[PDB]
Ligand binder design. Sequence first.
Ligand SMILES: *[C@@H]1O[C@H](CO[C@@H]2O[C@@H](C)[C@@H](O)[C@@H](O)[C@@H]2O)[C@@H](O[C@@H]2O[C@H](CO)[C@@H](O[C@@H]3O[C@H](CO)[C@@H](O)[C@H](O)[C@@H]3O)[C@H](O)[C@H]2NC(C)=O)[C@H](O)[C@H]1NC(C)=O
Ligand SMILES: *[C@@H]1O[C@H](CO[C@@H]2O[C@@H](C)[C@@H](O)[C@@H](O)[C@@H]2O)[C@@H](O[C@@H]2O[C@H](CO)[C@@H](O[C@@H]3O[C@H](CO)[C@@H](O)[C@H](O)[C@@H]3O)[C@H](O)[C@H]2NC(C)=O)[C@H](O)[C@H]1NC(C)=O
Ligand SMILES: *[C@@H]1O[C@H](CO[C@@H]2O[C@@H](C)[C@@H](O)[C@@H](O)[C@@H]2O)[C@@H](O[C@@H]2O[C@H](CO)[C@@H](O[C@@H]3O[C@H](CO)[C@@H](O)[C@H](O)[C@@H]3O)[C@H](O)[C@H]2NC(C)=O)[C@H](O)[C@H]1NC(C)=O
Ligand SMILES: *[C@@H]1O[C@H](CO)[C@@H](O)[C@H](O)[C@H]1NC(C)=O
Ligand SMILES: *[C@@H]1O[C@H](CO)[C@@H](O)[C@H](O)[C@H]1NC(C)=O
Ligand SMILES: *[C@@H]1O[C@H](CO)[C@@H](O)[C@H](O)[C@H]1NC(C)=O
Ligand SMILES: *[C@@H]1O[C@H](CO)[C@@H](O)[C@H](O)[C@H]1NC(C)=O
Ligand SMILES: *[C@@H]1O[C@H](CO)[C@@H](O)[C@H](O)[C@H]1NC(C)=O
Ligand SMILES: *[C@@H]1O[C@H](CO)[C@@H](O)[C@H](O)[C@H]1NC(C)=O
Ligand SMILES: *[C@@H]1O[C@H](CO)[C@@H](O)[C@H](O)[C@H]1NC(C)=O
Ligand SMILES: *[C@@H]1O[C@H](CO)[C@@H](O)[C@H](O)[C@H]1NC(C)=O
Ligand SMILES: *[C@@H]1O[C@H](CO)[C@@H](O)[C@H](O)[C@H]1NC(C)=O
Ligand SMILES: *[C@@H]1O[C@H](CO)[C@@H](O)[C@H](O)[C@H]1NC(C)=O
Ligand SMILES: *[C@@H]1O[C@H](CO)[C@@H](O)[C@H](O)[C@H]1NC(C)=O
Ligand SMILES: *[C@@H]1O[C@H](CO)[C@@H](O)[C@H](O)[C@H]1NC(C)=O
Lengths: 49, 456, 456, 456, 49
Amino acid sequence: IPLYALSEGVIYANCLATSCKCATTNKPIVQSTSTVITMIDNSKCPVVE
Amino acid sequence: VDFERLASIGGIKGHSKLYKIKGHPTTKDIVIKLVPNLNNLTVCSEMSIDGYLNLINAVIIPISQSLELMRNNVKDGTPNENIFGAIVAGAALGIATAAQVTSVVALHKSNQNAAKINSLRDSITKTNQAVEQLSLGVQETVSVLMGLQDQINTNLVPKINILSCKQLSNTLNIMLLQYYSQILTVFGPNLRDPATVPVSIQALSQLFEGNLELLTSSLGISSTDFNDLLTGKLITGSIIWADTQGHYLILRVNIPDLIEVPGAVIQEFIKIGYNFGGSLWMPTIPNKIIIRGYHLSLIDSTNCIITDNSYVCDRDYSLPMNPILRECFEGNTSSCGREMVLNSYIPLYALSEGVIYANCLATSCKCATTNKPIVQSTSTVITMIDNSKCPVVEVGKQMISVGSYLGQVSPNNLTIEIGPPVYTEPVDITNQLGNINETLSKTLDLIKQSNSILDM
Amino acid sequence: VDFERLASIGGIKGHSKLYKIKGHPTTKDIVIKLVPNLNNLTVCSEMSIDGYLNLINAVIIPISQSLELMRNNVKDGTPNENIFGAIVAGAALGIATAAQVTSVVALHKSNQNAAKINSLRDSITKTNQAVEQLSLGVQETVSVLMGLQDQINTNLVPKINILSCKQLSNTLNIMLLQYYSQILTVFGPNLRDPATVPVSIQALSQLFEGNLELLTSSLGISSTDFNDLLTGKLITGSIIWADTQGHYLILRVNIPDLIEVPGAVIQEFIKIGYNFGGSLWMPTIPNKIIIRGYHLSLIDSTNCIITDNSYVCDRDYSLPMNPILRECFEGNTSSCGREMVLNSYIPLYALSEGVIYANCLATSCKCATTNKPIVQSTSTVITMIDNSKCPVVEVGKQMISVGSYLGQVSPNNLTIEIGPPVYTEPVDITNQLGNINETLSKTLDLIKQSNSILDM
Amino acid sequence: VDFERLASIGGIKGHSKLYKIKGHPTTKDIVIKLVPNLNNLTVCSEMSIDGYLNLINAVIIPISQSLELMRNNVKDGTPNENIFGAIVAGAALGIATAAQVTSVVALHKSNQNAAKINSLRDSITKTNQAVEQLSLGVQETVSVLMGLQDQINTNLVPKINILSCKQLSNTLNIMLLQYYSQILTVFGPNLRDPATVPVSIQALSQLFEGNLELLTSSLGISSTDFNDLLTGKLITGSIIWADTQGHYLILRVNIPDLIEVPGAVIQEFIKIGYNFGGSLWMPTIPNKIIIRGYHLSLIDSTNCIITDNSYVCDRDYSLPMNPILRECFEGNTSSCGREMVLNSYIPLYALSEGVIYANCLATSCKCATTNKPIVQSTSTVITMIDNSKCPVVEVGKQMISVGSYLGQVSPNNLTIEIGPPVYTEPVDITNQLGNINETLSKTLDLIKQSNSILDM
Amino acid sequence: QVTSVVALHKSNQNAAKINSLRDSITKTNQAVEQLSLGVQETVSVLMGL
Ligand SMILES: *[C@@H]1O[C@H](CO[C@@H]2O[C@@H](C)[C@@H](O)[C@@H](O)[C@@H]2O)[C@@H](O[C@@H]2O[C@H](CO)[C@@H](O[C@@H]3O[C@H](CO)[C@@H](O)[C@H](O)[C@@H]3O)[C@H](O)[C@H]2NC(C)=O)[C@H](O)[C@H]1NC(C)=O
Ligand SMILES: *[C@@H]1O[C@H](CO[C@@H]2O[C@@H](C)[C@@H](O)[C@@H](O)[C@@H]2O)[C@@H](O[C@@H]2O[C@H](CO)[C@@H](O[C@@H]3O[C@H](CO)[C@@H](O)[C@H](O)[C@@H]3O)[C@H](O)[C@H]2NC(C)=O)[C@H](O)[C@H]1NC(C)=O
Ligand SMILES: *[C@@H]1O[C@H](CO[C@@H]2O[C@@H](C)[C@@H](O)[C@@H](O)[C@@H]2O)[C@@H](O[C@@H]2O[C@H](CO)[C@@H](O[C@@H]3O[C@H](CO)[C@@H](O)[C@H](O)[C@@H]3O)[C@H](O)[C@H]2NC(C)=O)[C@H](O)[C@H]1NC(C)=O
Ligand SMILES: *[C@@H]1O[C@H](CO)[C@@H](O)[C@H](O)[C@H]1NC(C)=O
Ligand SMILES: *[C@@H]1O[C@H](CO)[C@@H](O)[C@H](O)[C@H]1NC(C)=O
Ligand SMILES: *[C@@H]1O[C@H](CO)[C@@H](O)[C@H](O)[C@H]1NC(C)=O
Ligand SMILES: *[C@@H]1O[C@H](CO)[C@@H](O)[C@H](O)[C@H]1NC(C)=O
Ligand SMILES: *[C@@H]1O[C@H](CO)[C@@H](O)[C@H](O)[C@H]1NC(C)=O
Ligand SMILES: *[C@@H]1O[C@H](CO)[C@@H](O)[C@H](O)[C@H]1NC(C)=O
Ligand SMILES: *[C@@H]1O[C@H](CO)[C@@H](O)[C@H](O)[C@H]1NC(C)=O
Ligand SMILES: *[C@@H]1O[C@H](CO)[C@@H](O)[C@H](O)[C@H]1NC(C)=O
Ligand SMILES: *[C@@H]1O[C@H](CO)[C@@H](O)[C@H](O)[C@H]1NC(C)=O
Ligand SMILES: *[C@@H]1O[C@H](CO)[C@@H](O)[C@H](O)[C@H]1NC(C)=O
Ligand SMILES: *[C@@H]1O[C@H](CO)[C@@H](O)[C@H](O)[C@H]1NC(C)=O
Ligand SMILES: *[C@@H]1O[C@H](CO)[C@@H](O)[C@H](O)[C@H]1NC(C)=O
């Protein structure tokens, strides 16, 4: 089952089961309680793990 | 020592090695000649030797004068009913320490063998080889030696007629100035008082192009095990004669032996950084712990070579441990302390007997047999991992397997006692001037302001 | 940071350099042969090789045993949907750190290429000349050199019949013992655990008479610019094989690259003495301040070489400071400490952007065109001098011209907050401890009383 | 300073030596050429010199560019009608210190003699000997020198036709890379700024096989007395020209002179362990005290050589001391601190002008004249022993004679005022001001509860 | 698709190594051949017709 995908530089990622990080800051990314699918763009970090 | 609570605060028990100290040195006598013996160079040598001799006389003569003047300060003879003891005229010493007295006693013991070797002065000056032996007695021999005899027995010797004699004289002059610089380098502190200063075998080996085990094999001591291989930088020696006629030095060196102090175990440790309060803290605990019969002390390996199985020191370096630091290594690990580590080269996980101690909040933890991540417990910061959770472990980027068990009780479940932060600056001493002066005459204000109304 | 207040307290802003860290190392393999290949000396060399072989076999075998035990600790396995690699046994490793696991994974990675190099053992042993690079085709390569092969290809070879063969045997014995001392010297710590300890490249060059540029050119690194000419002491790398048959060691080294941390600037400072209260004080500030986007950190350039324009560290060495240091650097000259000096080698004037910061209380200050003295103002301690006062300046004996402009405000008209004198003593700590003890035992007695006299 | 009270607390007055500082240096100009003028090797040398030239040009050109850039900012012709001197362009320097300005003035002074030597460039480049002299003027001379010119005039020359030309070219290549590595080693910090950095004579000496004495003899300094033999490691010198045509470096060195500071006597001290409280302690005093007209201060001989009669420093190192330490040295043994030792290498007895200071509690003390033991007095700790008690004394194992007397004041009957047991502060005592200060900030909360006491 | 991107970025060096023997590829006159990629490595060039 895929849990992340890319759409025009937009990452939809289920970070509850997938590791999510920003190595500009070297921190993990956690799951919000208001949503399950995780929105990721360059506003959080431009280079993503 | 409790390794569970000390692992919970962040210190991991490393290897345990032995402690062995050099003891009982026996003596052996070497001789070092200084004037190079040219015998094939009688055709073209000029008198370039005279400049070298005038350079080295200023080293040879006052060393020998100080040696015989220290020799005059000790005499033998009976003090009345007492038999002997090498009675030392204390008015002839000025200011002297215990080691100088011991060295003077050593040269008084070695006067007889120094005279015995000095009887073979013409035997010393007739050598034309690099290193060879001469029979001192029926079962004793001497170890006369030169590193630079070979260089004017294999290099300047074949160019006796191919090259011009003035160029051999110039090259011999350059080599003699270089070698006189070498003796001026090695006998630097030895010119001050050449009777109490010990002599390193390494700086002696620098006179012979850095060949340590040539000198060791000519001495006769032979290493055969792993421990005596890295051992070899701690052989000491003493000047016993400084003869000006043949321009040589008779030296007495000591053959070492690594005796073992019983019950002493050198314990190593691993320090990791743990994230508490949003900050990465490092514990303030030392590395090497000497333990001997329930006694914790400090040592320094500033000069001690470390083997795979033991600690080898030239001399015992037992320093007292702080009793606060002893109680740190006891169950009161809140008295240990911690400091900031923001640098990236801080380890977060380590292995010990199939046991993984991992700070899992910053390091990824999962088990591929179960394909689930591992979460930090709220009651601890250091994370225990063994085969009970998963025998096959992923930590960070690396894939491992584990074994064994916890050990007495698990260090993850008990409560934690967090110490104070530690700073190292004299600015903190001025701040302790300031905040005690914020408090001291405010504590005097407690003393005043309480008693003002406690009367009624 | 406020440079005007820092100039008032006595610090002058020095240069600004960059910061670069070694990063992204690719791997290149070499081999190091130990047995010298004598081919011309097959007429008379005796069996002088035998003692050298017996000496090196004591230090060849256990490294090989340790490395194959390191390969035995790892096992290429895959439980379920694993990464199909790594996997070490926790019981078979004992106690280890993260870097030891990394070294084990590096051995498990490069075992294939180690077998690839070991396939050409007869090609390794037939190298008549010393330095050659071979390859495994178009991609992958290996290198080999011997610092002693030339000495038995241009020095010991031509005296094959002019000199006696026993003298060649003795000279080769002396040379082999010297070189065995050199390998014994460089692999000092390498005998303990020859998998997790890197190899200093300068100590490797010491085996070959200190020629770092020969191995630099033969390795493939060809530095051209200013910054990489001094750099080259940061090669590093670990051994991968210790083959006994051909008597060679297969080594893997890392080709470095200097990456740049963004936004980080190293700042230097100049500390001068100021005469306050009839006393000469120096400011107590660190010399180097690294800034990266409003973030002051501390660094130590103990192993870091400094070029004309940047800082070259092998790895990042960030250290923290107290927030009182941040107050000292930003706004609070009262929080900045001071120290007492009386020595003569204290500078009192300096130059910055054509602006003279000079203590005129001890140094003569005049303007030569007007021929008038410059007097210390009572409001300031450090004197600012620009071309507004005089473009032609005479300081002490020196004759200077100034220019440019001031910059925001002058430091002389701002008030100066002199901090407490930083001067510590263990006696001060001890009697402070006694003072604190007696005062809190007074206060705890009165607090027990005042808590018992709450309710009247 | 009171030696009797300081002997009562356990410190013995050592030797008294003088203090000498290097001062008033004159300057001598030398030249160092780089390209080896091979003349006998015009048949088989190939163009192996070209790689050496391209390697050294990237070093030589930027040094010359920075050298001409630093001398381009200084100008003569003072606009003041009476004063005349050298003016630097302070706007063009940017940031500079006092020593940099003084160095620029020095090169401005030496530019004329640099051009005078540069007029003899073809004389410099035509030398085929190792070290020789040329006619600079009617009485001035230069000291052009090469260490490697001997090696291609006594070693590489005679194998001109016996050995193959490519082998000579490869040997020349290896030697050129090794020597180019040596110039890269010595001119490390000089590449950043070759104007304000002096050059050590020993760093120059490793370019010529570590021959400091050859450079000392060719320079003109001829040390004859015992004090100047050890001196010579502190010779300073700076470059004045960096010529790229002949690829040579014109250097200016400073001939030193050891002046003597008046009235300053350096004093040594011997710290003996004393058994108080069943415990072995040591006094906390510095080893060396400089006294100059009743002025106790501190020095550090970290770079200063120590002779038998004097202390020789390259530059004055007067350090201040605490007034509590001055009271400790003068009158207040209660102000003197003590530290704990338990290690075996603590001497408990020493000699001073025939005066035995011996702690008899641990060391066996006897009188051989009477065959009785000597008991420790309860009023003192360190045992005074002179000829008044017994002339022939047994201490430890040793027979020792004694001499002199008490001098002025007897320490054997004097009262004891051993001060506080002061403690070292490695990392821990900061948390003893960090766990006790929070008890103080519990009492700061008790100030708020004392306000409640006042209110209720 | 991201995994395929990583696969081509992982194998472009070996693709260049195989492309280095383009003239060796076109000279085959039999059905199936094995040509040496490296020291102990090979590929399979093949033409059933
Ligand atoms: C080292 O010791 C020798 C031996 O002297 C003995 O030891 C000394 C420490 C003293 O205790 C001496 O009394 C004792 O004998 C010293 O050699 C001696 O030197 C002295 C001069 O210092 C010589 O005396 C001279 O001898 C002749 C007699 O014709 C004349 O030149 C002079 O008038 C003068 O008296 C003496 O002969 C000599 N030998 C002996 C056996 O005493 C030596 O000086 C001493 N110290 C040093 C630093 O070398
Ligand atoms: C390093 O590993 C090799 C390979 O062995 C493999 O790895 C080990 C860690 C274990 O997991 C093994 O089960 C596994 O096969 C070891 O070499 C092996 O050594 C053993 C002895 O220790 C050999 O057994 C001997 O074989 C013959 C049988 O005729 C007789 O001489 C003896 O009776 C004895 O049984 C074995 O053949 C050998 N090879 C293999 C493939 O197993 C190696 O010992 C090990 N460790 C070290 C320190 O070298
Ligand atoms: C070192 O100083 C020299 C000398 O110049 C003098 O000092 C300078 C600091 C300035 O104050 C100058 O005004 C003063 O004369 C400098 O060399 C000079 O450089 C300039 C270029 O900057 C040269 O001009 C060139 O000349 C020819 C004309 O045909 C052409 O190549 C160019 O079009 C250009 O105009 C000039 O000739 C030269 N010499 C003199 C005597 O002025 C030098 O720049 C300075 N700095 C360094 C780093 O070397
Ligand atoms: C060189 O000296 C040795 C040793 O004394 C001697 O055997 C040999 O004959 C000498 N050679 C010549 C050519 O004189
Ligand atoms: C230290 O531990 C002991 C038991 O070993 C306990 O009695 C004591 O209260 C502890 N002290 C602390 C935590 O300060
Ligand atoms: C730790 O305590 C928990 C309960 O808090 C218990 O389940 C566990 O077995 C303990 N671990 C031991 C005793 O090793
Ligand atoms: C507080 O400052 C005074 C001087 O004002 C000083 O004497 C005292 O020792 C200081 N208090 C401390 C250091 O606790
Ligand atoms: C010395 O060895 C070289 C290299 O193998 C060879 O060319 C030469 O002929 C040999 N010379 C002798 C005398 O054996
Ligand atoms: C420190 O500086 C700030 C402004 O940056 C100022 O408000 C404050 O009063 C200063 N504190 C002192 C001098 O203690
Ligand atoms: C410094 O302040 C004084 C008044 O105190 C004023 O005359 C002078 O111009 C000021 N200098 C500046 C702002 O550079
Ligand atoms: C202060 O220090 C000692 C330890 O040095 C402690 O035992 C004592 O109770 C304290 N108080 C006094 C008055 O000495
Ligand atoms: C070697 O050079 C010297 C000095 O230039 C010269 O006198 C001599 O003739 C030369 N010899 C040969 C064989 O070229
Ligand atoms: C220090 O010694 C002086 C006399 O030299 C004396 O007056 C003073 O009381 C002493 N102070 C002490 C012992 O604290
Ligand atoms: C030391 O004092 C005692 C009395 O306390 C006295 O008998 C003795 O002579 C004194 N020693 C001297 C002054 O040298
Ligand atoms: C002083 O106490 C406070 C509050 O307990 C604490 O934060 C601080 O670190 C202490 N000071 C030192 C120097 O440890």
